């Protein structure tokens, strides 16, 4: 509605639609970066006059497929090891210190972790 489409936000107040061709992505309306040019603005160009908007490339936004994934938990330890969760075809191994009391994402995958005790506190 000419307000969120051209503004960057953490989430979307409205429920997105897969069939709206003015959204930034099928699964998200507002862009996920301050410098990212809104899709509604870009499609208002000379070269989209006769080109069909339906067939244009609209990959699903990354910043949503991660937040659907439930947060991983660690039991009786304060170091989280993540190396892509795929074997030797992943990101370099990183160790995540769990001293802080919230969900700390991985360096590359974006996966979030926790401890055994703070499982009830972080989920709040």
């Amino acid at each position: 509605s000419t307000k969120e489409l051209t503004t960057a936000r953490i989430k979307d107040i409205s429920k997105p639609d897969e069939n709206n061709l003015q959204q930034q992505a099928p699964n998200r309306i507002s862009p996920w970066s301050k410098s990212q040019k809104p899709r509604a603005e870009a499609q208002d160009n000379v070269r989209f006059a006769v080109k069909d908007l339906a067939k244009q490339p609209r990959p699903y936004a990354a910043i949503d497929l991660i937040y659907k994934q439930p947060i991983r938990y660690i039991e009786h330890d304060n170091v989280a090891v993540c190396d892509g969760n795929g074997g030797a075809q992943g990101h370099p191994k990183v160790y995540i210190n769990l001293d802080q009391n919230k969900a700390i994402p991985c360096g590359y995958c974006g996966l979030r972790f926790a401890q055994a005790a703070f499982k009830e506190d972080i989920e709040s």
Binding site: N27, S35, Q36, K37, A42, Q43, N45, R47, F48, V50, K51, D52, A54, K55, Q56, P57, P59, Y60, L65, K68, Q69
Partner: protein, 70 residues
């Protein structure tokens, strides 16, 4: 040729002995997003891909604002 689905497209090229419908689940691709119907190359039609710049202009102009003499 672009109508050939990418999974089979590697099989038709003699790069694999395992057809894409015979893959073991430990090897397949598992995606969190829907996998709709295959779409070929869309040249010479109005559905052709159009490039555009994904970045906002680096300079932001000033909004006109006036406050009168006290």
């Amino acid at each position: 040729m672009s109508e050939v689905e990418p999974g089979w497209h590697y099989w038709l090229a003699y790069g694999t002995d395992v057809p894409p419908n015979q893959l073991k689940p430990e090897e397949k691709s598992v995606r969190a997003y829907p996998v709709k119907k295959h779409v070929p190359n869309l040249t010479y039609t109005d559905g052709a891909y159009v490039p555009y710049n994904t970045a906002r202009p680096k300079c932001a102009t000033w909004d006109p604002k006036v406050t009168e003499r006290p």
